[PDB]
């Protein structure tokens, strides 16, 4: 507790300069716990304090022993590499660093696609009224990074006990599709489930009438849909909903196959894990908004089959595009926001969640107007887009490689996204001097075009086969470490506030 005694008495017997994270210090059994940063490489540790039953199950070097006052028998201090077996034996004496479930509370997720960002992420949680997703990444995501579920939720843990919080937070599966993958994090402990059936989302406008009359058929014959909602009337915040036979055929030709994967998911959540999760259905990418008979429709059935979930991510009018802000009338938003939050309402209730809502400020006095009571947001390319811009402000070389790399690479990377970057409007980066290439994080097109080149950036290698822009990324964030998350932090915060939490 003393930081001196123990900074001292581990330079003099390691011969390295060891700094004490001081939050992370806990005190649990008899054992001491923390963290330690190497000033000359960067490199982290744990460093293991207590009886020998402990400090065995810890791999690692014995640096001596120590004399603590707390008996008079001297302690072991270990210190230790931050790998899986590890952190898996910390959990255990550190309760807390384990995901839970969040339930029906306002939450947010922060996503990490580099894995150091944690500890700004929980910094930018201060005294906010809301629940912290900490780990979340989705398959794609993970695809593009060369990650996966336990490196991950690995990353985002190590990163907690750095910051000594010892709070609730939760691990969501972002986006999955295949019970593989459902299999995989379930196994790894995550808690939250987003479930994406949109391979099975069909609009019946690209199919010719005898298709859709087939697909029809064979999911009424096996529901009897007709029966349950034809005719069938809904008076919600005011208004009539009808679900008039059209509305029902087209209704069920879009979302009936996608019903059915979510159940299927959800079976086997229910026949494989054993331990407390949560769910989320995600219908956000579909060609049209969501209309109100489908909201409708999609919670009815889910309550019919007996699929317990907590979000639904519904796709909001407008475009909500990566990096920038919102794109759209915001009085349609206004009007369908709170046709929705109603619905979620007299449904319910259940938690509306917003997929790539990083950055949209101009829509969030809606969204917190409408549903702030319970409400959740999805980030993890913007907590990037702000290590770039640390970059810029104290590695102007680096950034500048960088950028241009990134434009050379979007055409390649944009194809997965839809986004309506124009290029024109990147400035010229051979006009700004270095004091000021920070701002081109401030371009919305500079912006779109850095946030969908982070795998290239992330993986690309030379012709040697070494990283071209890996290492020295992670050995300036490495550095610049304060700043950085003071950064990310400020960021965070600012989409808090504006949620009105």
Known sequence: HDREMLEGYLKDRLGKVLEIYPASVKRKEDAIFFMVKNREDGEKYLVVIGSA?????????????????????????????????????????????????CGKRSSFGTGDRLGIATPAHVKAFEGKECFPFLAQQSVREMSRTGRNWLSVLDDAIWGIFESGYEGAFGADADHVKDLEDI???????????????????LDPSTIDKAAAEHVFFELNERHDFLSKYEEKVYEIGGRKYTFDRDSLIETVITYGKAVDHVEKCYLFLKENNRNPF????????????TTPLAHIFIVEELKRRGVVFTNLALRFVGEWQKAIDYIGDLKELDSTLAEHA???????????????????????????????????????????????????????????????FALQRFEKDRASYHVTTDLSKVPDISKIPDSQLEDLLNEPNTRQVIHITYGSVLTARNSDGSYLFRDELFKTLSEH????????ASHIRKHLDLLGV
């Open 53 to 101: 039953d402990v400090t065995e199950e810890f791999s690692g070097d014995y640096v001596g022993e120590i004399a603590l006052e707390k008996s008079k028998a001297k302690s072991k201090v270990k210190i230790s590499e931050r790998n899986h077996n590890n952190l898996l034996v910390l959990r255990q004496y550190l309760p807390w660093l384990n995901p839970s479930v």
């Open 183 to 201: 299999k995989t994090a379930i196994d790894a402990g995550y808690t939250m489930f987003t479930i994406d059936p949109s391979d099975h989302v």
């Open 342 to 404: 109603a619905i979620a309402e007299v449904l319910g209730p259940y938690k509306l969640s917003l997929h790539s809502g990083s950055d949209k400020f101009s829509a969030y006095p809606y969204f917190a107007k409408h549903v702030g009571n319970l409400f959740h947001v999805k980030t993890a390319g913007t907590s990037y887009l702000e290590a770039i811009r640390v970059v810029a402000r104290f590695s102007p070389e680096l950034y500048r490689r960088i950028h241009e």
């Open 278 to 289: 949560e769910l989320e259905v995600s219908v956000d990418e579909t060609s049209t908004p």
């Open 481 to 488: 470490e304060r700043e950085h998350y003071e950064q990310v």
